[PDB]
Amino acid sequence: SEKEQQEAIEHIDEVQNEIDRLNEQASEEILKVEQKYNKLRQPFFQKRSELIAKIPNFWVTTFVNHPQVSALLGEEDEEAMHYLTRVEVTEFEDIKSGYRIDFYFDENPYFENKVLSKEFHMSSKSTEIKWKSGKDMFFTWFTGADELGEVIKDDIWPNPLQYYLVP
Amino acid sequence: MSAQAAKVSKKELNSDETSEKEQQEAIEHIDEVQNEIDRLNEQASEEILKVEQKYNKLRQPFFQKRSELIAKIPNFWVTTFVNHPQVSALLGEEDEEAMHYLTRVEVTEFEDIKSGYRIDFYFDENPYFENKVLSKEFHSSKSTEIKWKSGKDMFFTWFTADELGEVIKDDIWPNPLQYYLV
Ligand SMILES: OC[C@H]1O[C@H](O[C@H]2O[C@H](CO)[C@@H](O)[C@H](O)[C@H]2O)[C@H](O)[C@@H](O)[C@@H]1O
Ligand SMILES: OC[C@H]1O[C@H](O[C@H]2O[C@H](CO)[C@@H](O)[C@H](O)[C@H]2O)[C@H](O)[C@@H](O)[C@@H]1O
């Protein structure tokens, strides 16, 4: 029994080793699916970008019509957001590495930066905002950072029209 | 006819046609592109579901075997829990004494046509309650009514949710052995 309990635990160790290999294989095959479809989708996101450029205030309105993102938007934040021209989400090619969100802003009284970028690593890198005279204030989320990041990546990004078109 | 044509002319001319139209056209063209995106999302989804079904079937006999082996080791699950940083903190010295009678944990997920998951806790005969199995389901959660013995009423507040359930399901279930040892 003291030996039998010992036999059982070695046997548990071996079964768990098989479990672990199978958990690893499943994760790898899933990740490859995501890597595959991230590549196939890229020409359509590019095209979709060009079309959104023809709808002024597309990204502001999309954000405003999203219950979670709106909770993140103060008065001046939303005014700054009027210079918001384009949002891109790019997942790193291997997917596991993380992703980046780019926010393009037209020339504005708030900051010098053309693009404000937030990167997520699997760790969080963001653009330093070159605020203009006395403008230093959403933009705090900029500097948990991954909740709004996931909302944009996973909710808004696949179908932003779902929010644009629905007050 | 003259008066009718006058009304018609006024209506069609007098009664924007750059910016509005541009917008409306763009929206229709974005929808077209979305349809391509959605088909791709659906293909990926299907692919991931086929991968998940395959490895689920591969994994199952091993998790079955692992449970039967676990039942031969006294204290496996207390030791696993006491060694887990978040479950350990919820165990008083009492709940720990009770968990010595805990022979078996099962986590069963029903995802296909969502019904959440279930954790079943099997106990040998013990001084604290009558129940052979204490279960909890999370979809927001159903739980076994514990039939305490006589002033034995006591972690087991959990059966009166999300965080602990997720910990056991997501952390410990796939590999309890890393806590049992480490
Ligand atoms: O792989 C299955 C998922 O496909 C979509 O999500 C991926 O594609 C999106 C763009 O269409 C990305 O924003 C996202 O990060 C990717 O995970 C779909 O939105 C999901 O519901 C599917 O499960
Ligand atoms: O298809 C049989 C069952 O597969 C899944 O369950 C197995 O895989 C899980 C992790 O992938 C293990 O945690 C579980 O113990 C295995 O039995 C699925 O969760 C079940 O609903 C399926 O019946």
Curated annotation (Swiss-Prot), chain B:
A long alpha helix in the N-terminus mediates dimerization, while the earmuff domain is responsible for core histone and dsDNA binding. The C-terminal acidic domain mediates the inhibition of histone acetyltransferases and is required for the DNA replication stimulatory activity. The keyword Chaperone applies. GO terms for molecular function: chromatin binding; DNA binding; histone binding; protein phosphatase inhibitor activity; protein phosphatase regulator activity. There is a cross-link at residue 136 (Glycyl lysine isopeptide (Lys-Gly) (interchain with G-Cter in ubiquitin)). This is Protein SET. Widely expressed. Low levels in quiescent cells during serum starvation, contact inhibition or differentiation. Highly expressed in Wilms' tumor. Some glutamate residues are glycylated by TTLL8. This modification occurs exclusively on glutamate residues and results in a glycine chain on the gamma-carboxyl group. N-terminus of isoform 1 is methylated by METTL11A/NTM1. Mainly trimethylated. Residues 21-60 are annotated as: Dimerization. It is found in: Cytoplasm, Cytosol; Endoplasmic reticulum; Nucleus, Nucleoplasm. Transmembrane segments: none annotated. The keyword Phosphoprotein applies. GO terms for cellular component: chromatin; cytoplasm; cytosol; endoplasmic reticulum; lipid droplet; nucleoplasm; nucleus; perinuclear region of cytoplasm. The modification Phosphotyrosine is found at residue 128. One of its GO terms (biological process) is negative regulation of neuron apoptotic process. Multitasking protein, involved in apoptosis, transcription, nucleosome assembly and histone chaperoning. Isoform 2 anti-apoptotic activity is mediated by inhibition of the GZMA-activated DNase, NME1. In the course of cytotoxic T-lymphocyte (CTL)-induced apoptosis, GZMA cleaves SET, disrupting its binding to NME1 and releasing NME1 inhibition. Isoform 1 and isoform 2 are potent inhibitors of protein phosphatase 2A. The modification N6-acetyllysine is found at residues 50, 132, 147. It is linked to A chromosomal aberration involving SET is found in some cases of acute undifferentiated leukemia (AUL). Translocation t(6;9)(q21;q34.1) with NUP214/CAN. Keywords: Acetylation, Chaperone, Chromosomal rearrangement, Cytoplasm, Disease variant, DNA-binding, Endoplasmic reticulum, Host-virus interaction, Intellectual disability, Isopeptide bond, Methylation, Nucleus, Phosphoprotein, Proto-oncogene, Ubl conjugation. Residues 21-27, 144-154 have a biased composition (Basic and acidic residues).
